[PDB]
Amino acid sequence: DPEVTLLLQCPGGGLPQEQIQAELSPAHDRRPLPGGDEAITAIWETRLKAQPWLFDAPKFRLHSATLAPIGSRGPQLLLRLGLTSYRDFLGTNWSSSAAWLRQQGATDWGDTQAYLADPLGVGAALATADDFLVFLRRSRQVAEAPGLVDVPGGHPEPQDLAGQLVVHELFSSVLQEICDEVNLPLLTLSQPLLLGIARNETSAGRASAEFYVQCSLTSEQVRKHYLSGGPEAHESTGIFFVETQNVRRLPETEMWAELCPSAKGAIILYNRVQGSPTGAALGSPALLPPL
Numbered sequence: 001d002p003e004v005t006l007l008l009q010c011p012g013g014g015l016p017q018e019q020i021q022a023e024l025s026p027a028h029d030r031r032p033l034p035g036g037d038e039a040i041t042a043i044w045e046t047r048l049k050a051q052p053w054l055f056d057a058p059k060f061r062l063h064s065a066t067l068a069p070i071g072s073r074g075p076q077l078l079l080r081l082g083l084t085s086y087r088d089f090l091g092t093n094w095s096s097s098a099a100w101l102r103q104q105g106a107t108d109w110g111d112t113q114a115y116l117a118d119p120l121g122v123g124a125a126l127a128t129a130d131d132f133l134v135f136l137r138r139s140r141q142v143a144e145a146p147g148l149v150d151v152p153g154g155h156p157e158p159q160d161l162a163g164q165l166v167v168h169e170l171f172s173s174v175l176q177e178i179c180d181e182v183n184l185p186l187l188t189l190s191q192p193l194l195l196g197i198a199r200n201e202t203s204a205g206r207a208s209a210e211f212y213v214q215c216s217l218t219s220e221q222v223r224k225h226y227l228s229g230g231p232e233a234h235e236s237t238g239i240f241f242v243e244t245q246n247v248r249r250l251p252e253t254e255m256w257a258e259l260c261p262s263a264k265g266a267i268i269l270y271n272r273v274q275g276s277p278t279g280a281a282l283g284s285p286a287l288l289p290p291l
């Protein structure tokens, strides 16, 4: 699918928190725009003068992610991170001129992303005790991917020797987003495993970390918890479930056309890293039917 590119596929069925290092450095920040950051300031002033209740927030910026040689001991992943903001996102990735900033970045820095905010998103493939994944319908009133299907997630907000605290906030934030939006108790959720990193080509290449989380509740109990919050307890307008059996072929369904690019990323990485068995037993024709 051309609206999603894989930056990273994790080994071993996905990486726990203890196997990831982060390097948070101003060397990983966005570069100042060619004619100056005054362009970002002008877009922000126009937006506030229309919507004065808006506020800025800091974000992590993804620079790059390097996997160790497979089968090695020690830390398996290095995440290179900078800092950005909602304001910088609205003035770059979301700008009408975002494709021009990518061309300029290639020319000036040999890096299509050099002049982009590129805030790091998080998302979950969330599995129930009865083997379904959880999907959410987006409001038709929001600016981004209105009315489309999504998975749980949300752009983490800042605050290996501050590195480990940054990895902790990324893993924490995926569980926190599931509690806030799906209304599940924290104690029903497994520690997340990182499946990979996917890039949204419809948002100038901004990246999301995609995780696997297991819930001890059935689909029926997850639905009850979500609905029991009422319309004000959640940003989404509805919840639904697809058997993990059927997720394998999702790209061939009519649902695929309704999935926002970052949820497409979560499903592709789930299928490659948690699905696609490698051993004789799970690989046998009766358990892995052809076609």
Ligand SMILES: CS(=O)(=O)Nc1ccc(CN)cc1
Pocket (backbone or CB within 6 Å): 153, 154, 155, 156, 157, 173, 177, 180, 235
């Ligand atoms: C309103 S929202 O969709 O919950 N937005 C959001 C989601 C996740 C994080 C992570 N810190 C921050 C903000």
Ligand SMILES: CS(=O)(=O)Nc1ccc(CN)cc1
Pocket (backbone or CB within 6 Å): 244, 245, 246, 248, 249, 287, 288, 289, 291
């Ligand atoms: C392809 S299928 O006929 O929809 N059935 C299927 C799908 C996935 C698995 C792996 N658990 C097993 C069976």
